Design a protein around this ligand. Structure first.
Ligand code: HEM
Ligand code: 7W4
Length: 289
C-alpha cells in the first residue's frame, strides 16, 4: 500500500507559513481553554493520535489520509478530548480550505510545539485525503496502564526504537490528564515545552496511588503525576539511561524530539525525489508578529 505525497496545487513555503501563522495567532487568542493551558498541548496530542494509528506491516493508518475527520476514528475512545483540537482547527480550515486534513492536523502539532518554545520541527506538505473506508479501526493507540515491555513492543509497530520512544514521551511535560477523557487525573499543568518530564521522573518522590476512576497512577507530594507507562521509563534500565541523558541535556532532547516527531508525522508517506525540502516555519516571535 503506497501513499505518495502530492503538493497542494501551486502552494509553496509562504502558503504554509500563513497557515502556521493563523494557527499560532489563534493559540495566542484563545488563551482561556483548559484553565488557561490554551490549546497547544491538545494539538500536539491530536497530531500524535492521527499519526499513531500507523502500522508498518501493511501501511494502514498514519497521518496521510486525514481519516480522523470520519466518525469511526473521531469517536475512538482513545481520542476522547481531541474534539477540542478539531474544533480549534475548524476556522483555520475554513480560511485555508485548500490544505488537506492530514496536513492541517500534523501542522497543528508542529505549530503548537514551536509556539510553546519547543524545538523547530521540519514539516513536509502533501498528505492527501483518503475515503472513509480507509479509516483504521479503533484500538491501535497505546494503553496507559502497562509496563516497559508493552511500551517497547507497541512502538515497534510505528518503527520507533528506545531512543525515539523516550524522546517522544517528553511531550508529557505538556498539558495534563483529564479524568473524564482517560481515567487519569492531576499533575498540574504546563504549556511551555521543556525537558521537565525527565527531571520530574528522576527527582520527585513518587507514590503508586489509585485515582477516582480506580486506576493506578504515580503521584508526587509536589502535585505531579506519571502514568504507569511514563514511570516504566525509569523501571527499565535501557529506558532509564536515556531518561537521564535527556534530564541532563536540554538541547539533545530538543534535537532528538524534533527528529522523532517529524518521523512520527511522516510515517507511511512516500515523498517523490523531486518533492520540496522540508519547511522550517518561523515562530510568531521570530516574525515580530
Ligand atoms: C505509551 C504511549 C502514550 C500513552 C499511553 C499516552 C497516554 C496519555 C494519556 C492517558 C493522556 C491524558 C489524555 C487526557 O486525559 O486528556 C495523555 C495526554 C497527552 N499526551 Fe500522551 N500518551 C502516550 C504517548 C504520547 C506521545 C508519543 C505524545 C506526543 C509526542 C503524547 C502527547 C500528549 C500530550 C501533549 C498530552 C496532553 C494533552 C492535553 O493536555 O489535552 N503522548 N497521554
Ligand atoms: C503535566 C502532565 N501532562 C501529561 C500528559 C500525559 C500524561 C501525564 N501528564 C502530566 N502529568
Amino acid at each position: 500500500l503506497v501513499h505518495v505525497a502530492s503538493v497542494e496545487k501551486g502552494r509553496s513555503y509562504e502558503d504554509f507559513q500563513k497557515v502556521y501563522n493563523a494557527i499560532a495567532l489563534k493559540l495566542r487568542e484563545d488563551d482561556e481553554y483548559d484553565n488557561y493551558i490554551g490549546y497547544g498541548p491538545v494539538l500536539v496530542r491530536l497530531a500524535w493520535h492521527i499519526s499513531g494509528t500507523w502500522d508498518k506491516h501493511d501501511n494502514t493508518g498514519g497521518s496521510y489520509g486525514g481519516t480522523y475527520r470520519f466518525k469511526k476514528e473521531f469517536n475512538d475512545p482513545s481520542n476522547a478530548g481531541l474534539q477540542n483540537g478539531f474544533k480549534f482547527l475548524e476556522p483555520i480550515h475554513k480560511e485555508f480550505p485548500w490544505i488537506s486534513s492530514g496536513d492541517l492536523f500534523s501542522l497543528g502539532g508542529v505549530t503548537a510545539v514551536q509556539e510553546m518554545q519547543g524545538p523547530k520541527i521540519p514539516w513536509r506538505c502533501g498528505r492527501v485525503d483518503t475515503p472513509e473506508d480507509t479509516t483504521p479501526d479503533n484500538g491501535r493507540l497505546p494503553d496507559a496502564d502497562k509496563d516497559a515491555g508493552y511500551v517497547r513492543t507497541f512502538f515497534q509497530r510505528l518503527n520507533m526504537n528506545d531512543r525515539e520512544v523516550v524522546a517522544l514521551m517528553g511531550a508529557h511535560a505538556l498539558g495534563k490528564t483529564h479524568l473524564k477523557n482517560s481515567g487519569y487525573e492531576g499533575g498540574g499543568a504546563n504549556n511551555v515545552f521543556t525537558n521537565e518530564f525527565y527531571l520530574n521522573l528522576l527527582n520527585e518522590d513518587w507514590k503508586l496511588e489509585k485515582n477516582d476512576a480506580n486506576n493506578e497512577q504515580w503521584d508526587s507530594k509536589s502535585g505531579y503525576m506519571m502514568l504507569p507507562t511514563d514511570y516504566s521509563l525509569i523501571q527499565d534500565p535501557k529506558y532509564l539511561s536515556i531518561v537521564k541523558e535527556y534530564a541532563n541535556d536540554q538541547d539533545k532532547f530538543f534535537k532528538d524530539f524534533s527528529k522523532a516527531f517529524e518521523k512520527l508525522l511522516e510515517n507511511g508517506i512516500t515523498f517523490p525525489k523531486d518533492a520540496p525540502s522540508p519547511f522550517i516555519f518561523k515562530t510568531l516571535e521570530e516574525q515580530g508578529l
